[PDB]
Structure formats: structure tokens, C-alpha cells
Design a protein around this ligand. Sequence first.
Ligand SMILES: O=S(=O)(O)OC[C@H]1O[C@@](COS(=O)(=O)O)(O[C@H]2O[C@H](COS(=O)(=O)O)[C@@H](OS(=O)(=O)O)[C@H](OS(=O)(=O)O)[C@H]2OS(=O)(=O)O)[C@@H](OS(=O)(=O)O)[C@@H]1OS(=O)(=O)O
Ligand SMILES: O=S(=O)(O)OC[C@H]1O[C@@](COS(=O)(=O)O)(O[C@H]2O[C@H](COS(=O)(=O)O)[C@@H](OS(=O)(=O)O)[C@H](OS(=O)(=O)O)[C@H]2OS(=O)(=O)O)[C@@H](OS(=O)(=O)O)[C@@H]1OS(=O)(=O)O
Ligand SMILES: O=S(=O)(O)OC[C@H]1O[C@@](COS(=O)(=O)O)(O[C@H]2O[C@H](COS(=O)(=O)O)[C@@H](OS(=O)(=O)O)[C@H](OS(=O)(=O)O)[C@H]2OS(=O)(=O)O)[C@@H](OS(=O)(=O)O)[C@@H]1OS(=O)(=O)O
Ligand SMILES: CCCCCCCCCCCCCCCC(=O)OC[C@H](COP(=O)([O-])OCC[N+](C)(C)C)OC(=O)CCCCCCCCCCCCCCC
Ligand SMILES: CCCCCCCCCCCCCCCC(=O)OC[C@H](COP(=O)([O-])OCC[N+](C)(C)C)OC(=O)CCCCCCCCCCCCCCC
Ligand SMILES: CCCCCCCCCCCCCCCC(=O)OC[C@H](COP(=O)([O-])OCC[N+](C)(C)C)OC(=O)CCCCCCCCCCCCCCC
Ligand SMILES: *[C@@H]1O[C@H](CO)[C@@H](O)[C@H](O)[C@H]1NC(C)=O
Ligand SMILES: *[C@@H]1O[C@H](CO)[C@@H](O)[C@H](O)[C@H]1NC(C)=O
Ligand SMILES: *[C@@H]1O[C@H](CO)[C@@H](O)[C@H](O)[C@H]1NC(C)=O
Ligand SMILES: *[C@@H]1O[C@H](CO)[C@@H](O)[C@H](O)[C@H]1NC(C)=O
Ligand SMILES: *[C@@H]1O[C@H](CO)[C@@H](O)[C@H](O)[C@H]1NC(C)=O
Ligand SMILES: *[C@@H]1O[C@H](CO)[C@@H](O)[C@H](O)[C@H]1NC(C)=O
Ligand SMILES: *[C@@H]1O[C@@H](C)[C@@H](O)[C@@H](O)[C@@H]1O
Ligand SMILES: *[C@@H]1O[C@@H](C)[C@@H](O)[C@@H](O)[C@@H]1O
Ligand SMILES: *[C@@H]1O[C@@H](C)[C@@H](O)[C@@H](O)[C@@H]1O
Lengths: 241, 241, 241
Amino acid sequence: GSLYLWIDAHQARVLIGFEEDILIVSEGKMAPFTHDFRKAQQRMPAIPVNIHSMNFTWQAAGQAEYFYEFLSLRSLDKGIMADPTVNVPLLGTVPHKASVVQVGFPCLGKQDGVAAFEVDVIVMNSEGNTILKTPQNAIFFKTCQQAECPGGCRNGGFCNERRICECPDGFHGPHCEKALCTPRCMNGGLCVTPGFCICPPGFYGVNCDKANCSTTCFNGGTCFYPGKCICPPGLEGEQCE
Amino acid sequence: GSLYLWIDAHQARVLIGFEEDILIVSEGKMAPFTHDFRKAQQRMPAIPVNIHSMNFTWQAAGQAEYFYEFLSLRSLDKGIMADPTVNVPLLGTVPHKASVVQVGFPCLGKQDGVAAFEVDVIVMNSEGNTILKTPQNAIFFKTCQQAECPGGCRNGGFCNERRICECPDGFHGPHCEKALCTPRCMNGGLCVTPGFCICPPGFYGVNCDKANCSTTCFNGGTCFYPGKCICPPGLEGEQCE
Amino acid sequence: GSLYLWIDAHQARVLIGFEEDILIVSEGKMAPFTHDFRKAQQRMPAIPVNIHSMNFTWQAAGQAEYFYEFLSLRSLDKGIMADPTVNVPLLGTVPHKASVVQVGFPCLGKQDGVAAFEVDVIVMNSEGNTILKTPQNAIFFKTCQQAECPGGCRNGGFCNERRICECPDGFHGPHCEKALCTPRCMNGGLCVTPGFCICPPGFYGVNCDKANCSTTCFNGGTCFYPGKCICPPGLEGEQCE
Ligand SMILES: O=S(=O)(O)OC[C@H]1O[C@@](COS(=O)(=O)O)(O[C@H]2O[C@H](COS(=O)(=O)O)[C@@H](OS(=O)(=O)O)[C@H](OS(=O)(=O)O)[C@H]2OS(=O)(=O)O)[C@@H](OS(=O)(=O)O)[C@@H]1OS(=O)(=O)O
Ligand SMILES: O=S(=O)(O)OC[C@H]1O[C@@](COS(=O)(=O)O)(O[C@H]2O[C@H](COS(=O)(=O)O)[C@@H](OS(=O)(=O)O)[C@H](OS(=O)(=O)O)[C@H]2OS(=O)(=O)O)[C@@H](OS(=O)(=O)O)[C@@H]1OS(=O)(=O)O
Ligand SMILES: O=S(=O)(O)OC[C@H]1O[C@@](COS(=O)(=O)O)(O[C@H]2O[C@H](COS(=O)(=O)O)[C@@H](OS(=O)(=O)O)[C@H](OS(=O)(=O)O)[C@H]2OS(=O)(=O)O)[C@@H](OS(=O)(=O)O)[C@@H]1OS(=O)(=O)O
Ligand SMILES: CCCCCCCCCCCCCCCC(=O)OC[C@H](COP(=O)([O-])OCC[N+](C)(C)C)OC(=O)CCCCCCCCCCCCCCC
Ligand SMILES: CCCCCCCCCCCCCCCC(=O)OC[C@H](COP(=O)([O-])OCC[N+](C)(C)C)OC(=O)CCCCCCCCCCCCCCC
Ligand SMILES: CCCCCCCCCCCCCCCC(=O)OC[C@H](COP(=O)([O-])OCC[N+](C)(C)C)OC(=O)CCCCCCCCCCCCCCC
Ligand SMILES: *[C@@H]1O[C@H](CO)[C@@H](O)[C@H](O)[C@H]1NC(C)=O
Ligand SMILES: *[C@@H]1O[C@H](CO)[C@@H](O)[C@H](O)[C@H]1NC(C)=O
Ligand SMILES: *[C@@H]1O[C@H](CO)[C@@H](O)[C@H](O)[C@H]1NC(C)=O
Ligand SMILES: *[C@@H]1O[C@H](CO)[C@@H](O)[C@H](O)[C@H]1NC(C)=O
Ligand SMILES: *[C@@H]1O[C@H](CO)[C@@H](O)[C@H](O)[C@H]1NC(C)=O
Ligand SMILES: *[C@@H]1O[C@H](CO)[C@@H](O)[C@H](O)[C@H]1NC(C)=O
Ligand SMILES: *[C@@H]1O[C@@H](C)[C@@H](O)[C@@H](O)[C@@H]1O
Ligand SMILES: *[C@@H]1O[C@@H](C)[C@@H](O)[C@@H](O)[C@@H]1O
Ligand SMILES: *[C@@H]1O[C@@H](C)[C@@H](O)[C@@H](O)[C@@H]1O
């Protein structure tokens, strides 16, 4: 094994208070506290009102390729909290360089109270086998407080106690209406001052949605990178044969 | 070679002032200033009163496994400074992910003056051979100033100039008596708000001391991880045969 | 591929404003915005007066060795801006550990206006073949404002709006005349309080210029590390035969 998934010391100081790396996956295996995942589910409280998003660092150190897939990112209480977001594309290859994953919990602000959610993700080997996964029906909670802003915050903005909208990347102003780029960049894209979006590897366009493949995937295969492709059971190889 | 041991730029700014990575081990070999280790021992002053602990970053980049062992962490002047500590278990495998090692120098506060210490550590290959090591009888110094606190600081706490105890992880209050978890977490464990300890890989329990092994080590062999085990000279393999 | 060249999130916040990793090279291939390098050259403005230097992070994750060579670092407008600098030696091996490259743009302060420059660099494989390179005649710009200091700043120091010289590493005072070490450390060396320079791997001396080689390179070969050596076309191997 070579997979490492953890929380950085800087993020750790906001959530727990202790400035240290919180290891989740080490050498391709889950941390000792994750074995009894359910006993760990109790020892985890609802995400506080102050914590809006969470930074999860990951990397495949070895020469071995590892693929990830976010199966379900559903909010069970849609009236309070909107479906949780990721600054990474749902399906893709895990980087060999230490990279941060921004897991955003969007509270609507219209209703007060604690809202539940699902975060289902699978990690697979080059052969296409699930090694590390989210144990069946994982439910995590997030506390959302009611906050009213004059006019209302647009494009995933949350109203602060000082009645000022907290605008997200590529947006600014009082209601977050003044945008730099015309379409907002997706899959982890970035808008420069002139405009447009700096597209992540595997995507191109204006919003970074169009994806090219050097090798087309056969027999109901999903392409994510022109290097490697996921194959259904019974079919093996590059083009799934 | 693939071993890299260095000091991070953020730590470097506190000790030297210059914000840059201080490389010690590069590509499995010691840095040019370490060759004449003794000439480097002069150019190193006593650890200042303000610097309480030091952060040492390390990682095995290649597919090759590397094992470390802290042989001796003794304080030669026990009346001034207590034996230096490490937030890592004495024996173990060096991570493939960039990880920080907190080397704490505990000044008792009862006596004023400079105290000497020993930091002996060995780095070994998969075969079990010492490649990188601390050259024979390494003596480093730490300046400790006398500071008196009303009542006295407990559980490795040092009294500040403002007469307030500097409580360590898992402890708080005026004398550091108010603890979250009942036993303090060891080997790099972390206590959550409810309690208990988030155990590091290779340990389990309440204080993270109990260690399990999938393969038992024969002929006087010490187990640290169920994957690999250290074997004495003459015996080679997984179970030491 | 295994090469990764990017800009760190902390540096990104100063230049663009968005705190996120700006990927340039991913898995040995250039980022989607770099393909039409010229269209990317327009979307890049002149380096602002406030930004004096830029931090570029890089690393070769795989067991594969990668060599870099800074071919040209020329300032086309020598009257305004002096030739751009790098805290890394021109020719060398790319680290397997995440390391920062300080690209300094030295404005002379004598003249006001925007100055152009060239940054040519090549990345090669173990066989000695250029894989990733700077596309032909790359011209980037830097805005330099006129600032006068009483006496004048020495050893690459730039005068601030408060008329105080911004002294570089190993220098301090009003005109940056008071130096710690007598010769200034080169190739990424560091001067301690007593003096001298902590030499980077592959260099030794007082200024870190003298380089040793365990294997001498034949038929017009340039040595950088005693492990690997660059060979001209027609000759292949360790000693270039
Ligand atoms: O002096 S000011 O109070 O007016 O602030 C001037 C600086 O505002 C910037 C960036 O401020 S920063 O975000 O805190 O660094 O421009 C940004 O803010 C202005 C509005 O100023 S205000 O104080 O926030 O209202 C925005 O103009 S507008 O959208 O309100 O009309 C800028 O949007 S735009 O770039 O002009 O499209 C906004 O830029 S950004 O969206 O935040 O990127 C700086 O201008 S900047 O450096 O071009 O970004 C100003 O610094 S400056 O030295 O005066 O230019
Ligand atoms: O408003 S206060 O001055 O009273 O400070 C309130 C916040 O104190 C916290 C954390 O403060 S922090 O460490 O600086 O962020 O609780 C922590 O401090 C209190 C005592 O407050 S005091 O000002 O430091 O004396 C401790 O209570 S006690 O130990 O003194 O009785 C907390 O211990 S305990 O969690 O209550 O067991 C101590 O928590 S911790 O040991 O530092 O983890 C915040 O409470 S917290 O967020 O639950 O940690 C308070 O913020 S809050 O919004 O008012 O709750
Ligand atoms: O109390 S003071 O205002 O005098 O500042 C005292 C501290 O100055 C240091 C470091 O200051 S720091 O850089 O901000 O941390 O020494 C450094 O500054 C002094 C001059 O003080 S002044 O206020 O900047 O003028 C320099 O002396 S001199 O060069 O002007 O004669 C030091 O150079 S030298 O080390 O004495 O050669 C300069 O050190 S450095 O070049 O910046 O490394 C601290 O001394 S230090 O800790 O040895 O570096 C002083 O803190 S202390 O607790 O008073 O010693
Ligand atoms: C990368 C995408 C997948 C992963 C994406 C799916 C998961 C997405 C949701 C994860 C976030 C929800 C977990 C809990 C977050 C949290 O806030 O932790 C609870 C406490 C918080 O601390 P507190 O009780 O609020 O107190 C703070 C103030 N004091 C008193 C401490 C000073 O903090 C703690 O004590 C423990 C925090 C450390 C544990 C966090 C990790 C838990 C999530 C495990 C997910 C891994 C499983 C999936 C991967 C196989
Ligand atoms: C990871 C466990 C092992 C390793 C654990 C064993 C070692 C544990 C003790 C290490 C710490 C003791 C070394 C020195 C620490 C120190 O404070 O450095 C002295 C100077 C400090 O600077 P100063 O003289 O106080 O001045 C500061 C203010 N100015 C004026 C600069 C602005 O700073 C410097 O100029 C040089 C600092 C950089 C050198 C630090 C590394 C030295 C330790 C080498 C250990 C490696 C060998 C063992 C591994 C093979
Ligand atoms: C490592 C040595 C080689 C590499 C060394 C050779 C290159 C050396 C020069 C590189 C630096 C020059 C590039 C541009 C630097 C820069 O300032 O970016 C322009 C804008 C700046 O933003 P701004 O327009 O000033 O606005 C800031 C305030 N706002 C309004 C945003 C809130 O920022 C941006 O919008 C885009 C910034 C991100 C792009 C930077 C990378 C461009 C350089 C590519 C070089 C790679 C090619 C060579 C390697 C194959
Ligand atoms: C650096 O050391 C400080 C204590 O001096 C510690 O709080 C901090 O978390 C350490 N940095 C890292 C990355 O662990
Ligand atoms: C596909 O896109 C990648 C960048 O993501 C590019 O390097 C490659 O050349 C493209 N292939 C084709 C056929 O366009
Ligand atoms: C980033 O650049 C600044 C100078 O602008 C430098 O002081 C800092 O140390 C650099 N960051 C790193 C990690 O080197
Ligand atoms: C030993 O502990 C590890 C976690 O450190 C666990 O994954 C493994 O299954 C355990 N083996 C046995 C036999 O309990
Ligand atoms: C950590 O999360 C914050 C938002 O809460 C984000 O701004 C920051 O850039 C993240 N850190 C990294 C390295 O991405
Ligand atoms: C060459 O220098 C390296 C350090 O850069 C050193 O380890 C090696 O032993 C030296 N070889 C000779 C012959 O001096
Ligand atoms: C991607 O995964 C493959 C297996 C098929 O289910 C496709 O329909 C899907 O888009
Ligand atoms: C671990 O190392 C082995 C070689 C033996 O010395 C054991 O007794 C020790 O605990
Ligand atoms: C290093 O590169 C080799 C190929 C020759 O051009 C030498 O002269 C140079 O210094």
C-alpha cells in the first residue's frame, strides 16, 4: 500500500484545537479509530456553525495508480443544508503530490437547526477493485444557524452575523452579483482577473466541463483520463476487452 | 536512496531567522555540513529559552521501506532539564508522506543554566542495515531559565514570565490539572472533546500502548508493524528464519 | 510520468487573491491552459510593484530521476530590471521532496516603468531527453517603480516607500552593509549567526561554489551530482561512452 488520506494541522486547529495531522488512511489501510467506524461516528459531533468547509489532504506516494469515485453527496435535510460540495471532480485519479480537497457544507440560512448528510467515496486499484471505501450508510451532521441578509446572498454565499454576504471564489460585492468570469469555473478551475478559467488536468472549455480522451472506452466504460480507464467486471485492459 | 530529513521554513524562522528549508538528509545521504559533524557541533549554540520544542520533517519518497529507532534520549543534566521527548514511537517505519516530529526539551524551571543532552537515532534498510545514524556521543545543549509559578505546573508544563502555566496537549487550567481524557494519549495520540485517544497506526487502547502483530517475530525479534519485522544478524526474512 | 510543478496556495493569495494550488505540470504533462502557451501569455499581466519574488514548488514523486537546466535568465530591459535570480543552482536534479524555488525579479529603482524578461528552463529524463520545456522565446513582464533611498541599498536591496532598505538574506542595517558571513552564500546556502554557509547537496566551501564528483564525466560532459551525469548525443551511460 501507498495511499495516505489525512487532515492538515492548520485545519485541525479550527475543528479540534490541537495543531497536528489527523491521519485517516495510512499505507493503504484505515487508521485504528476507523475500524469500529460506528463507535467513531458517536465520538464525532455536528459540524459547528463557524466551520463552513473542511480541508482533506490526500496522495498516492508509490508508483501505483489509485482511482477515487464520489458515489453519493446527498443532504438528508434539504430544507436546512444543501447537498455537500467538493472542489474536485467526482471521478478521477488520486494525485501523487499532496493535494487538499475542499468539502463545503452549504447551509441555506432560511432555517435554523442541525442537518444530516452522506459522504460516500471509493478508492480503487489499477485492476479496478475497491480497497478503501466509506462503510455502508455513513451519516454525518452539520449545525446551521438562521441568518438574514438584506436582498439575499447569491451563488452559494452565507450571511454573516455582521449582515455581510460571504462571497465564494469568482464572486464579490454586497449580494455576490458582481462576478469576474461570466460562467463560474467548475471541477477546481480558477478565474484570473481578465477572466476565463484555469482548467484542471483532464478538462477544457470556459467552465471546465468538456473532457478529452486519447483512448475511447468500450463496453459501457467511463473515461476520466486519456491514460487509464475503468472497466466493468469480466472485461480487463486499457480499452476494456 | 530516497530518504529526506529536514527542518521546515516556518520552524527555521524561529531558530535562525531565515525562512527556508534546512536539509539534513538528502537522497539517503547526509548534507555537506554534516560530514565534519564535530565542526558542525561547534557552529550550533544552546537551544534558546524561548524555543521549547523543535519540528523535524521526514519522508521516504521511494517504494523502499525505511525503519527508524531512537536508541538514547537522555538528559546529562537531569536537575535542570528532563529527558528530551518525541511525539513519535521510539521504534517504527518512516512515513512515505511528509510528517513532522516534535522534539520537546523539558526544562524543570527549578534551576537556571544550560543543560546538555543526547539524541541517538538510527535509520535502517529493508534488509536491516544501519545506513544513516547519529555519529558517536552527540551532545547538544539547551538554555533553561528559572521561573516560579504559584502552585506549580503539572504534566510537563513550563511557567511563563507572566506567571501562567503553558499547558501541553490534553491539559488546561491554572496548574494544568483540568484534563479532557483521563489517561494522557501516547505515541502521538490525540484526545477529542468527549474523550479517549485517536490512536496512531500500529497502536490501540485508551492510552495507545497495546500493539498488535499479524506475524509473530521469532528468535528474539521486536515487532512494530504487522507488515515488516527487525531480525538479528544471521537470521533473515519476514518471521526471522 | 511523475513530475509536478505548481504554485503554492500561500503565494497564490498574493498574486491572484484565491488561496489554491496553481498546477503547471501534472503527471509529467503541462496543464490544459499551457497548451496554447501564447494565449496564456496574454492572460498574464506584468508582475506588480508589490510582488518582488515568486515561489514555485516542484517534485519528482516516482522512482524516476529528473534533471533540470536553466538555459537563459536574461532581462531585456537592463536599465529598469536586473537579470532574474533563482535560489537553486542552474543545472541539477529535481528533488523527490516538495521544494520551493524563489524566482527573484530585481528592480534597480533608478528608473520607473515596466521591464520584460526571459525564463528558459528544460526538464530531462534519465536517458537525457528534453520532455518538458519553456516554449520558444518566452517573454514575461515586471512593473518597477522609481524609489530613492539616502545612501543607496547594497547587495540586491530594494528601497521601500518608507525610505528603508529591504535587505536580503545574510544582510542587515540601513544600507545593507552589515553582513553576517563575509562572502554571501550561493546556490541556496544559508549563513548561521557565527558565520559560514550551510552548503546545499553537491556543493562545498565558504560560498558553496566548489563541486565534487565521484565519477568524472568524459567527452565534454558536465557534472552536477556524483550519482548521475549528462551525456551528449551519440554517447550513453554513467561516464558517457
Ligand atoms: O481602496 S479601496 O477601499 O477602494 O479598496 C481598493 C482595492 O480594492 C481592490 C481589492 O481589494 S481587496 O479585495 O481587499 O484586496 O479591488 C476589489 O475591491 C473593489 C471595490 O473596493 S471596495 O473597497 O471593496 O468596495 C472592487 O471594485 S468593485 O467590484 O466594487 O467595483 C474590485 O472589483 S474589480 O477588480 O474592480 O472588478 C475588487 O477586486 S476583486 O474582485 O476583489 O478582485 C483593489 O483593486 S485590485 O487590486 O484591482 O483588485 C484595490 O486596490 S487598489 O490598489 O486601490 O486598486
Ligand atoms: O468566554 S470565555 O472567556 O469564557 O471563553 C469561552 C470559550 O472557552 C472555551 C475555549 O476557549 S479557547 O480555548 O480559547 O478557544 O472553552 C475552554 O475554556 C473554558 C474556560 O474559559 S476560560 O476563559 O478559559 O476560563 C474551559 O472551561 S473550564 O475548563 O475553565 O471550566 C473549557 O474546558 S471545557 O471544554 O469546558 O472542558 C475550555 O475548553 S478547552 O479545554 O480549551 O477545550 C470555549 O468552549 S469550547 O468551545 O467548548 O471549547 C468557549 O467558547 S464558547 O463559545 O463560549 O463556548
Ligand atoms: O531591542 S532592540 O530594538 O535593540 O532589538 C533587539 C533585537 O535585535 C536583534 C534581532 O532583532 S530582530 O531582527 O527583529 O529579531 O538583533 C538584530 O538587530 C540588532 C540591532 O537592533 S535594531 O533594533 O534592529 O537596531 C543588530 O545589531 S546591529 O546589527 O544593529 O548592530 C543585530 O545584528 S547582530 O546580530 O547583533 O550582528 C541583529 O541581528 S540580526 O542581524 O538581525 O540577526 C536581537 O539580537 S539577536 O537576537 O542576537 O539577533 C535582539 O534581541 S535581543 O533579545 O535584545 O538580543
Ligand atoms: C475525502 C472524502 C471522504 C471524506 C468525506 C466524508 C466526511 C465529510 C464530513 C467530515 C467532517 C465531519 C466529522 C467531524 C467534524 C468535526 O467537527 O469534528 C468534531 C470535533 C469538533 O470539535 P468540537 O467538539 O466542536 O470542539 C471544538 C472546540 N474544542 C472544545 C475542541 C476546543 O472534532 C473531532 O473531535 C474529531 C475530528 C477529526 C475526525 C474527522 C474525520 C471524520 C470523517 C472520516 C471520513 C473518512 C471516511 C471516508 C474516506 C474513506
Ligand atoms: C529526527 C531525530 C534526530 C534529530 C534529533 C537530534 C537533534 C536534536 C537537537 C537539535 C536542535 C539543536 C541544534 C541547534 C538548535 C539551534 O537553536 O540552532 C542554533 C542556531 C540558533 O540561532 P541563534 O544563534 O539562537 O540566533 C537566533 C537569532 N538570530 C541571531 C539568528 C537572528 O540555529 C542555527 O544556526 C543552526 C540550526 C540548524 C541546525 C539544526 C540541526 C542540528 C541537529 C542535527 C541532528 C541530525 C542528526 C540525527 C539524524 C541523523
Ligand atoms: C520554475 C522555473 C520555470 C518558471 C519560471 C518562468 C516564469 C517566471 C515568471 C512567472 C511570473 C509571471 C507570470 C504572471 C505573474 C502574475 O502576477 O500573474 C498575473 C496575475 C496577477 O494578478 P493581478 O492581475 O495583478 O490582480 C491581482 C489583484 N486581483 C485583482 C487579482 C485581486 O496572476 C494570474 O492571474 C495568473 C497567475 C498564475 C500563472 C503563473 C504561472 C505563469 C508562468 C509559467 C511558467 C512555466 C513554464 C516554465 C516551466 C515549464
Ligand atoms: C511546530 O512546532 C509547534 C510547537 O513549537 C507546534 O505547535 C506546531 O504544530 C509544529 N508544526 C507542525 C506542522 O506540527
Ligand atoms: C487531451 O487533453 C490532454 C490535456 O488534458 C492533452 O495533453 C492531449 O494532447 C489531448 N489529446 C487530444 C487528442 O486532444
Ligand atoms: C515565499 O516567498 C517569500 C518571499 O516573497 C519567502 O520569504 C518565503 O519563505 C517563500 N516560501 C517558502 C516556502 O519558501
Ligand atoms: C492489527 O492492527 C491493524 C491496525 O493497526 C489492523 O488493520 C489489523 O487487522 C489487526 N490484525 C489483527 C489480527 O487484529
Ligand atoms: C483550508 O480551508 C480554507 C477555507 O475554510 C481555504 O481558504 C484554504 O485555502 C484551505 N487550505 C488549503 C491548503 O487549501
Ligand atoms: C562528494 O561530495 C559528497 C557530498 O556532496 C560526499 O558525500 C562524497 O563522499 C564526496 N566524494 C568524495 C570523493 O569526496
Ligand atoms: C461510468 O462507469 C461505467 C462502469 C458505466 O456505469 C457508465 O455508464 C458510467 O458513466
Ligand atoms: C527488540 O530488538 C530485538 C533485536 C531484541 O533486542 C529485542 O529484545 C528488542 O526488544
Ligand atoms: C555542460 O554540458 C555539456 C554537454 C557541455 O556543453 C559542457 O561544456 C557544459 O559545461
